[PDB]
Amino acid sequence: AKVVDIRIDTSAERKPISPYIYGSNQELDATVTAKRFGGNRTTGYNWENNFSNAGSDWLHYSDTYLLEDGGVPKGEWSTPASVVTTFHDKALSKNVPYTLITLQAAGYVSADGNGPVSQEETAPSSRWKEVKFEKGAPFSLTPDTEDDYVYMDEFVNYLVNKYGNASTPTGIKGYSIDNEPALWSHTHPRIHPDNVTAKELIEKSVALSKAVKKVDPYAEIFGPALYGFAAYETLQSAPDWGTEGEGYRWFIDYYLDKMKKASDEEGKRLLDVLDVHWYPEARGGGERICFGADPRNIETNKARLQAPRTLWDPTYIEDSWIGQWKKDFLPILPNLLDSIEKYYPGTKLAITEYDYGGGNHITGGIAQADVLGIFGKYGVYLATFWGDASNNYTEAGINLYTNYDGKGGKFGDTSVKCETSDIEVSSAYASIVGEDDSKLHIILLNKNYDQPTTFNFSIDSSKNYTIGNVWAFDRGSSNITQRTPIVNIKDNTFTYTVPALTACHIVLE
Ligand SMILES: [Ca+2]
Ligand SMILES: [Cl-]
Ligand SMILES: [Zn+2]
């Protein structure tokens, strides 16, 4: 039998878990705690008329896709910002406390919904409106659709007028500086044909942040929404990186340092949240764990289970180009957080797109639960999964934290010390509520593929626990079901054997 010791000390290493790590980009069958309006379609979205452009995703079409996909009623298609107000209204109706709205920085937004934009209609042209961050004339709630410009501060003003500012109960809390700027010239060449420079990205980020914060001083600015590691390192070989990056280990440090400098000159914080996208490059069984992975490939599934360790564990070297060539930047979350500490202390960290794959397989659910445990433990502020409602095991992984009992039961909001003797076969995360250890929550993941694992728990707490109720999912179902409670707790010790490939949430009282 495989035997693993779990040691918890409810008084030790206490740290808040940000509530907003359990979010999504799409409409999921899960209770989520943040919603992001972002990704490729948001770069060219025009709040005045709701048109947007597919870019490379579909023939550079300008059309009504976001109206249709967001479920906006036809009677509101010509109402300013109806894509965004439907998106936020839906989030509020689902009791989601954080909405993150992407603002447009690549330079232009769709003028029309008339179909493909030719290369000869690359902006500026009749097919586009130029974005300015500051109107510099009085705002209107009925923006002028006939002129040549779309104003970001006027868009924010419309939202704040409707919902209140970000400090209020219904306000939109965060705005993103566009999406994947190092891919603008690939995804949106008809808006931004040139490869983005580091200098342009800082100039725009600073200017947009200033413009937003004049309207809503409480709103959080997120950037740069980088697509993946090569953008973290060099802004995708940006044309000015050889000069701008002198003395910087990677583009992340340059971005933090320059946003801090601009904030110090301005006299207020202009970057609230360092925002990146992380689609694992980890491979197993001869393929990446996401983007077309075969769920029959057991070696891929095993690699998916271990891949979350690249986020935090210095001993884990994944099979990928990042694991091979970029060891100096792994594990990735401590590297990002260390950069924040060195170059812009107090900046938060968000993972605004990610997907570990296997979302309809038990290993996608276990990996998802592991990732959410890591985000909480290591201090990520906000995270939003990218993927649809067919990812039933990913959704179970989210609900294990946000709604394990179907009536709103949730993981605690204060992380506490919880160590496993075998980080390969298992993960375990523990939390309490506020400062109170009366209820101790434990997420316990058995990564053993084809055998049970016996866990010997030893807990140091101010309480003497007498029952552990249990909810779990497994290969039999992604529905989270209540299991027999743990009852033989002797001096805050117990033994609990869990079947192969099972994810559990234990609630001790
Ligand atoms: Ca206009
Ligand atoms: Cl990018
Ligand atoms: Zn689903």
Side-chain angles (χ1 to χ4, degrees):
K2 178 58 177 174
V3 180
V4 173
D5 295 327
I6 308 294
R7 301 186 41 86
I8 293 166
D9 179 348
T10 66
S11 75
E13 304 175 6
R14 293 187 175 192
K15 55 173 68 66
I17 296 171
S18 179
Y20 313 126
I21 60 170
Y22 312 110
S24 70
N25 288 269
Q26 284 64 52
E27 294 177 334
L28 296 184
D29 310 309
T31 301
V32 303
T33 63
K35 283 301 306 295
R36 171 172 179 260
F37 173 76
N40 290 345
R41 270 281 181 164
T42 67
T43 294
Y45 171 71
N46 182 340
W47 76 280
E48 302 185 344
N49 59 26
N50 303 292
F51 300 131
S52 63
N53 194 281
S56 63
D57 288 325
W58 193 268
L59 303 179
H60 315 282
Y61 268 44
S62 280
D63 61 28
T64 52
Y65 173 81
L66 288 174
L67 289 159
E68 294 170 56
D69 187 71
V72 183
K74 279 169 175 66
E76 294 300 320
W77 282 17
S78 61
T79 303
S82 63
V83 163
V84 169
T85 64
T86 299
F87 186 95
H88 188 52
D89 288 347
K90 281 178 164 183
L92 292 174
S93 82
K94 297 308 300 201
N95 308 103
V96 174
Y98 204 110
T99 297
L100 172 60
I101 297 305
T102 296
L103 301 177
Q104 291 65 51
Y108 295 86
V109 294
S110 291
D112 60 61
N114 306 332
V117 177
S118 73
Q119 191 169 352
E120 296 79 44
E121 289 171 331
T122 294
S125 78
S126 66
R127 305 303 306 283
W128 301 106
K129 300 300 182 181
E130 183 187 321
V131 173
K132 288 187 162 62
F133 301 143
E134 289 189 32
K135 188 176 187 187
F139 299 139
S140 179
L141 302 177
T142 51
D144 185 356
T145 53
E146 303 313 302
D147 69 8
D148 296 340
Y149 301 103
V150 173
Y151 299 103
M152 293 300 100
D153 60 354
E154 190 171 54
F155 179 14
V156 175
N157 179 73
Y158 182 97
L159 296 173
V160 171
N161 179 261
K162 183 171 174 318
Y163 293 115
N165 71 45
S167 76
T168 72
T170 58
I172 288 165
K173 286 180 171 69
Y175 296 96
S176 178
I177 304 163
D178 210 290
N179 183 64
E180 300 188 351
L183 296 186
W184 285 338
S185 59
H186 181 255
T187 303
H188 293 290
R190 313 279 158 269
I191 296 178
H192 192 292
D194 297 330
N195 295 329
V196 70
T197 64
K199 286 184 303 300
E200 175 181 310
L201 185 55
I202 297 305
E203 286 192 9
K204 286 179 168 188
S205 298
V206 171
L208 176 56
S209 180
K210 288 168 177 174
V212 171
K213 290 180 173 268
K214 282 202 267 180
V215 177
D216 189 344
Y218 305 102
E220 287 179 319
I221 289 286
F222 288 60
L226 299 177
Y227 83 91
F229 190 89
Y232 301 13
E233 196 184 352
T234 66
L235 196 67
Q236 196 95 327
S237 305
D240 61 348
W241 184 239
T243 47
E244 291 302 298
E246 183 175 7
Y248 292 101
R249 197 171 75 104
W250 57 343
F251 177 78
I252 295 295
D253 289 342
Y254 173 95
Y255 184 78
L256 289 163
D257 191 44
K258 298 307 181 188
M259 293 304 291
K260 180 161 194 292
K261 173 180 190 279
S263 296
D264 285 351
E265 293 169 0
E266 178 65 16
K268 64 195 181 197
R269 173 172 287 273
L270 296 177
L271 178 66
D272 296 279
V273 190
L274 180 70
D275 174 340
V276 297
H277 300 350
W278 179 259
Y279 291 98
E281 292 274 16
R283 299 173 41 86
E287 54 176 353
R288 196 179 180 170
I289 63 167
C290 60
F291 305 160
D294 181 350
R296 294 102 61 190
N297 186 324
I298 303 303
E299 291 288 317
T300 315
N301 297 338
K302 287 177 175 175
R304 182 176 303 102
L305 292 169
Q306 302 304 327
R309 290 167 62 195
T310 300
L311 297 171
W312 66 271
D313 175 5
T315 72
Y316 186 70
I317 302 304
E318 70 181 30
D319 181 6
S320 77
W321 67 268
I322 302 175
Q324 177 168 350
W325 296 100
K326 307 294 172 177
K327 290 176 174 66
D328 188 55
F329 297 96
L330 299 180
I332 192 65
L333 301 178
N335 275 268
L336 292 167
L337 292 164
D338 171 78
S339 287
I340 287 166
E341 291 177 338
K342 286 172 171 162
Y343 290 103
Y344 198 168
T347 305
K348 298 164 181 197
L349 178 62
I351 314 300
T352 61
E353 297 182 21
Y354 64 93
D355 174 16
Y356 279 67
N360 64 348
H361 190 261
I362 184 55
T363 63
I366 295 174
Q368 178 67 17
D370 203 29
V371 168
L372 294 173
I374 292 156
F375 289 170
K377 178 173 177 177
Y378 295 90
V380 171
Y381 177 64
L382 178 147
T384 43
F385 172 71
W386 185 282
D388 72 21
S390 72
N391 294 283
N392 54 304
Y393 277 101
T394 313
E395 290 169 327
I398 295 166
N399 280 336
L400 196 66
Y401 289 80
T402 63
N403 193 347
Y404 60 79
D405 60 7
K407 61 182 181 175
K410 60 185 183 184
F411 196 61
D413 62 355
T414 296
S415 175
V416 305
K417 183 174 186 61
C418 176
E419 306 300 338
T420 53
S421 64
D422 186 336
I423 69 179
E424 185 186 36
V425 79
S426 71
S427 302
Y429 305 95
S431 60
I432 65 177
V433 180
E435 324 304 328
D436 197 327
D437 65 3
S438 294
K439 298 198 179 168
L440 173 60
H441 292 259
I442 304 165
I443 297 298
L444 176 64
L445 307 180
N446 188 20
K447 298 181 277 165
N448 201 329
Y449 213 94
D450 44 40
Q451 289 308 143
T453 301
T454 297
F455 293 98
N456 292 325
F457 281 79
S458 299
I459 300 165
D460 294 337
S461 174
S462 80
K463 308 287 180 303
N464 191 232
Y465 302 112
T466 59
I467 187 166
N469 285 109
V470 181
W471 290 258
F473 64 83
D474 54 36
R475 280 171 293 182
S477 182
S478 55
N479 298 144
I480 300 169
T481 59
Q482 192 171 0
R483 310 303 175 101
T484 303
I486 293 159
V487 306
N488 205 314
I489 306 175
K490 291 193 183 69
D491 294 334
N492 276 348
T493 73
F494 61 90
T495 297
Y496 188 57
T497 296
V498 179
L501 300 179
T502 295
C504 304
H505 189 151
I506 302 170
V507 184
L508 291 156
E509 61 193 60

